[PDB]
Amino acid sequence: TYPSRPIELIVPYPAGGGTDVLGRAFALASVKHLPQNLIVVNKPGASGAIGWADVINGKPEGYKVALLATDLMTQPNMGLTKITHEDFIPIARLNYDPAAITVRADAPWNTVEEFLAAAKQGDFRVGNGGNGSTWHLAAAAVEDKTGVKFNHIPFAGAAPAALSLLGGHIEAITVSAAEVYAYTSTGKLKTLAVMSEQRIKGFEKVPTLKERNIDISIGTWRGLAVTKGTPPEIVNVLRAATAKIVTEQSLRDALDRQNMGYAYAEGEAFGAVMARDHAFYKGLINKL
Numbered sequence: 149t150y151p152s153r154p155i156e157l158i159v160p161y162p163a164g165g166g167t168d169v170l171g172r173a174f175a176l177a178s179v180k181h182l183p184q185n186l187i188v189v190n191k192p193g194a195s196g197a198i199g200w201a202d203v204i205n206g207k208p209e210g211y212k213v214a215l216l217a218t219d220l221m222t223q224p225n226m227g228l229t230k231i232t233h234e235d236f237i238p239i240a241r242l243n244y245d246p247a248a249i250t251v252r253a254d255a256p257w258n259t260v261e262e263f264l265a266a267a268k269q270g271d272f273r274v275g276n277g278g279n280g281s282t283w284h285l286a287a288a289a290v291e292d293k294t295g296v297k298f299n300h301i302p303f304a305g306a307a308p309a310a311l312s313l314l315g316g317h318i319e320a321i322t323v324s325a326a327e328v329y330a331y332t333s334t335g336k337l338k339t340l341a342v343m344s345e346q347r348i349k350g351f352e353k354v355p356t357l358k359e360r361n362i363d364i365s366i367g368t369w370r371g372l373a374v375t376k377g378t379p380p381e382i383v384n385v386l387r388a389a390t391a392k393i394v395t396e397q398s399l400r401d402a403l404d405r406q407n408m409g410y411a412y413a414e415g416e417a418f419g420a421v422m423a424r425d426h427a428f429y430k431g432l433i434n435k436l
């Protein structure tokens with residue numbers, strides 16, 4: 149009966165970081181719900197592709213689980229790997245941290261519509277965490293749907309971009325809502341829209357872009373998958389266990405400590421989101 153020996157959780161991040169913490173918290177929370185241990189392996193490199201290859205090239209027996217992340221959407225579409233979401237069977241999404249449009253609290257704009265009408269008259273500087281990464285692509289996605297043209301300002305990560313905005317050196321940032329909450333909750337920045345499917349915790353008074361008729365959902369995420377070809381009975385054991393594991397308070401606490409949003413999605417739903425996002429990133433990366 150599956151599982152009959154330990155299961156490796158292949159985490160393509162170094163030990164000690166947020167995703168390692170998430171992976172090990174998931175493993176700890178799995179003790180009541182799987183009769184074999186989940187063992188974390190840290191295999192970073194090539195934006196996840198060394199870890200993906202370990203799972204894909206492994207046997208379809210259920211004893212390797214990939215901790216999938218956003219890079220799976222961008223790397224193949226940048227022509228940097230042949231690996232795609234279709235090499236996997238999804239178990240579940242765990243985490244999603246949507247991008248947001250955030251300005252300084254004293255900005256003249258009080259709605260995303262006012263911000264866009266102003267931006268269309270100029271070359272607003274929009275900070276991100278690096279060229280070609282999620283928050284840059286988030287700003288580019290806004291350009292694509294609204295016709296505005298920004299001056300993209302990459303920094304060495306999201307935190308320096310937020311500090312720049314706080315100092316009045318740029319007009320907006322499109323980094324994660326999670327990264328600006330410390331400032332929006334304390335009146336230093338204000339968020340005009342979240343690029344999510346639904347309103348999120350801590351930002352319940354802020355509209356999504358989608359509800360304002362701007363069709364964009366983008367952000368970083370973490371989920372679980374096994375290699376294509378894994379028997380359905382095995383996939384179902386993992387999906388059923390994961391549905392239990394995500395209700396564990398210890399796992400939710402770990403996500404909170406790492407400032408990572410909880411966003412459980414069932415396997416098939418996670419698969420559908422990845423297919424949609426793959427096509428979205430393909431189109432946007434090609435345009436850029």
Ligand SMILES: [Cl-]
Nearest residue numbers: 161165166167
């Ligand atoms: Cl991380």
Ligand SMILES: [Cl-]
Nearest residue numbers: 245246325326
């Ligand atoms: Cl977020």
Ligand SMILES: [Cl-]
Nearest residue numbers: 387414415416
């Ligand atoms: Cl499921």
